[PDB]
A paper describes a structure:
Therefore, we reasoned that the particles in a single Cx36Nano-WT sample might include conformationally hetero-junctional GJCs that contain two opposing hemichannel regions in different conformations. We collected hemichannel particles (~13% of the total particles) in the FN group, traced them back to the original GJCs, and removed duplicates. This process led to the selection of 14,155 GJC particles with two hemichannel regions each belonging to the PLN and FN groups, 3D reconstruction of which with C6 symmetry produced a conformationally hetero-junctional GJC structure at 3.34 Å resolution. Compared with the GJC structures in the full PLN and FN states, the map density of the hemichannel region in the PLN state was weaker because of the smaller number of particles used for reconstruction, but that in the FN state was significantly improved in the cytoplasmic half of the TMD, as we expected. These analyses suggest that two opposing hemichannel regions are not structurally interdependent and may have different conformations. It should be noted that the hetero-junctional GJC structure is not the main conformation in the Cx36Nano-WT GJC sample, but is the average of only 13% selected particles, which are still conformationally heterogeneous. In the hetero-junctional structure of Cx36Nano-WT GJC, the hemichannel in the FN state had two flat layers of density blobs blocking the pores around the cytoplasmic and extracellular ends of TM1 or TM2. These densities inside the pore were as strong as those of the lipids filling the nanodisc and were not observed in the other hemichannels in the PLN state. To avoid artifacts from C6 symmetry imposed during 3D reconstruction, we confirmed that the pore-obstructing densities were also present in the density map reconstructed without imposed symmetry. The features of the pore-obstructing densities, including double layers, flatness, and a thickness of ~4 nm, are highly consistent with those observed in the pore-occluded structures of the Innexin-6 hemichannel and pannexin 1 channel, suggesting that Cx36 GJC in the FN state may also be obstructed by lipids.
Connexin 36 (Cx36) is responsible for signal transmission in electrical synapses by forming interneuronal gap junctions. The direct connection between adjacent cells is made by end-to-end docking of two hemichannels (termed connexons) from each cell, each consisting of six protomers, thereby forming a dodecameric gap junction channel (GJC). Cx36 is mainly expressed in neurons and forms the major component of GJCs in electrical synapses, playing important roles in cognitive functions, including memory consolidation and epileptogenesis. Here, we determine cryo-electron microscopy structures of Cx36 GJC at 2.2–3.6 Å resolutions, revealing a dynamic equilibrium between its closed and open states.
Numbering used by the authors:
A (entry chain F), B (entry chain A), C (entry chain B), D (entry chain C), E (entry chain E), F (entry chain D): 19 to 100, 194 to 277
The structure:
Amino acid sequence: STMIGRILLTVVVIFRILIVAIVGETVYDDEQTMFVCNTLQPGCNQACYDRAFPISHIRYWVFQIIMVCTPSLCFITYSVHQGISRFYIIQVVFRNALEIGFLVGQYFLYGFSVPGLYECNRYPCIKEVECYVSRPTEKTVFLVFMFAVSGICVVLNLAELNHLGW
Amino acid sequence: STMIGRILLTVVVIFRILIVAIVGETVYDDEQTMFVCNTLQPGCNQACYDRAFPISHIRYWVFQIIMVCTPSLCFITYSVHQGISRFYIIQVVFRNALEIGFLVGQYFLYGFSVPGLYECNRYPCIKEVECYVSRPTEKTVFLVFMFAVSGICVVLNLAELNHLGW
Amino acid sequence: STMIGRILLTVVVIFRILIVAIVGETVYDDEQTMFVCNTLQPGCNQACYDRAFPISHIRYWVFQIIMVCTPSLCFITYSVHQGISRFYIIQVVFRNALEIGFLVGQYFLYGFSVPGLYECNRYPCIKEVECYVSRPTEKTVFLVFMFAVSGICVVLNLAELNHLGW
Amino acid sequence: STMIGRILLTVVVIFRILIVAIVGETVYDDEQTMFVCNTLQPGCNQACYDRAFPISHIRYWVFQIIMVCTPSLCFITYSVHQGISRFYIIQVVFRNALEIGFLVGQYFLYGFSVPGLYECNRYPCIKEVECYVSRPTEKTVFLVFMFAVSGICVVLNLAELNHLGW
Amino acid sequence: STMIGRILLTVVVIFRILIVAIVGETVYDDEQTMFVCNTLQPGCNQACYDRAFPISHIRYWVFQIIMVCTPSLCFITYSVHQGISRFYIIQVVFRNALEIGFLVGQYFLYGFSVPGLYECNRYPCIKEVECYVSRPTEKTVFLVFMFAVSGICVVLNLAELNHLGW
Amino acid sequence: STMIGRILLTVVVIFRILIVAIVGETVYDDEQTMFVCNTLQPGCNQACYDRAFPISHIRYWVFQIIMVCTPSLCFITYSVHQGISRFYIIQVVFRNALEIGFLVGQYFLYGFSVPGLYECNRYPCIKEVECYVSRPTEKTVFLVFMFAVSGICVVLNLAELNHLGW
């Protein structure tokens, strides 16, 4: 039961990397060119887009994917250059911490949906203005799916922690 | 008779992978930039495009392609790390289920054609408006072809299910 | 005399694949953005382009190239997994049939030239309107060249069929 | 003296292929989007561009590069599958003929310069109109350089023909 | 304690290279097309963009990444071609110097944030004008993160310098 | 002292290759689309851009990079096919000549800076007009850096010439 957990963990991790590398690069491609606000102000479009989407989903996901894979490279470099079980335990702890932190950060940054309308009141805009997002449903689907995958990985890492940890 | 079926399953699967990777990436390239509605409303174009095409065909097809290939990687990782016939049976069942689910989902999401006109009545649009789709015939051809290929794969997997299953 | 024919068949097949992969991807790149109609109607451009070019030449050619190479992969998978001469004969028959069918289909779909003007009378256009095609001469040259190459391949396959067949 | 000719021929051939693959793909990138005519006629821009540049330089050069390398693949396939000196002589004759034909065709199609102005009188344009070409000097430089390289290759092939031929 | 420092130095270096190669290429993609100024002057947009962003962040970072890796290639070429400890010491000194210089240069060129507004008074603009930057928050995040990573690398190199140096 | 010179020559050459291949391809990407002139004349933009930038910097640099590496391939092909020291001496002389010629040509074509304004008086423009260049500072930095690198390579080649030559 604990044996299959590693196979499912590696498969989900590679699955996530593949999804992000192959499909995510192109849903967000036109994020800002298709974002439009009802206004005649130069620079209101830029300001309101920046306020609505401070960091794009795909940037956060690439960063998270790369950062949650760093203990593996550290352990590999340590072993190739040269306790070792001590390294295994610490890298497992670190991966668990990183994945819980990244999941919580995703929840706090983005929530669970991307709405189609946005109300912005930042300079140079005059009082509050209404702006319109491109492809909200697809981005919501991607958000929910990525949350599910990250939850799966967190669950597996907690499983292994409780299996080895005392 | 059942022997050649595996070779034809492998060939159809690789054929589908190639078709999606080489051709699908560029029929849908201009899906939203060429989508136009008869209106003077900012944000009506975005809303009506999102309502007409919630998830693009090529996104669904890439996701399906990746998801219907996961039992193979699971089995491979299980064998490389280390009954085995039990794994073969379960992964066959899982592939069958996944392909039937994906085919039914395709039918329920997209139907059998992509019309050239679309009637949309979502905010910020004023009552119902008419919008025009880009490349409807090519997308219809792609839809029908992919449905045919997925049906072929489902048929083959059911064949093997009934051959081994009791 | 029949020996060199196989070498020339292999060379023409690889030649065709190379031509399509390297050059064809970029003549058709701006097919719809440069297509223009003399009208003030929203959506007439989309409708008339779709009626003039239901499936782009390069899509048909990529599909044909991939489909005329499937017997080779089938035979290879059959041999790697494990009469064999029976497989050779059947795959030769199948390749011949596929190439004659694809050549006839090309002739029936596209003809021998791409005109510079197109007259369209599809909704939402008001009566018949005139539209203008981009790069007609280059596309005509490509059409004629591809027809010639496909004819060469058909001729070679019929030659070998009559050499082996009785 | 005849020994070094082979080394210089292979080096010039690879040099030409590299130049075309790395740099030529991007001088011609904006050929039609930057082409402009002094007129208010829809479709005059397309017609006059097609009349001024029936086949783009880079398309002809890629086709020529691929076609002048076909005897090498034919000879290689003939040798891998299995007089041989007879094949060497014939492929040398064929390469010579192909390169002289391609050089003459280049001269007859394009000349020695690309002018900055073009005068066009094709339908739908009203009488003669003036159009303006993008990047004429760079294209002239490329034309002259490619003519020089092709001349070098022709000279080398004639040298070797006269060395072996009687 | 000094042993593990090398593993983290190599891992941080590869981490930084990966981040720059995979994600940085596309935040800055639309830097100038989305930059807009409140004016009716031709050429004011170009002048004010050039004054606000003389060298793009990603250009500086790629240059720095490549330049801080030159001692490694020099040492490798020296060893493959053929004291050696003398080379190790000098290349360590050189890497330390290069990374401190690059960090200070980053601080002096860019600071710690990218503001959303810019005030420009360069010809051809009439007196001072206001311009608006695209994606300021993401660029600020990237700036701060890269500063942190470069600081980490500087710290590690100083650590090892003081470990070996006397 | 003369031993390390070869290592530094190979490292600087590879460094230059990398800089041109990775970063230079994208500073010049929008060279003509962002070039603008203060005028209402069709075709004045094209003419004045062509007069200001006859050959783009990156085209010259790629050509130079490829041309200064041809003696190496010639020598390699000569050795693989089969005095040899005579070849070494001649190829060194040829590389020296090529690099001095290319450096002088760069100086005569481009100078040491790219100005932000350009004054053009070519047909179809009416008398002299003012045009505005995109990204002048970055292009000036690139110019100066490439001049420095090419000077370094020239210096090294002259060093080796005088070391071996008499």
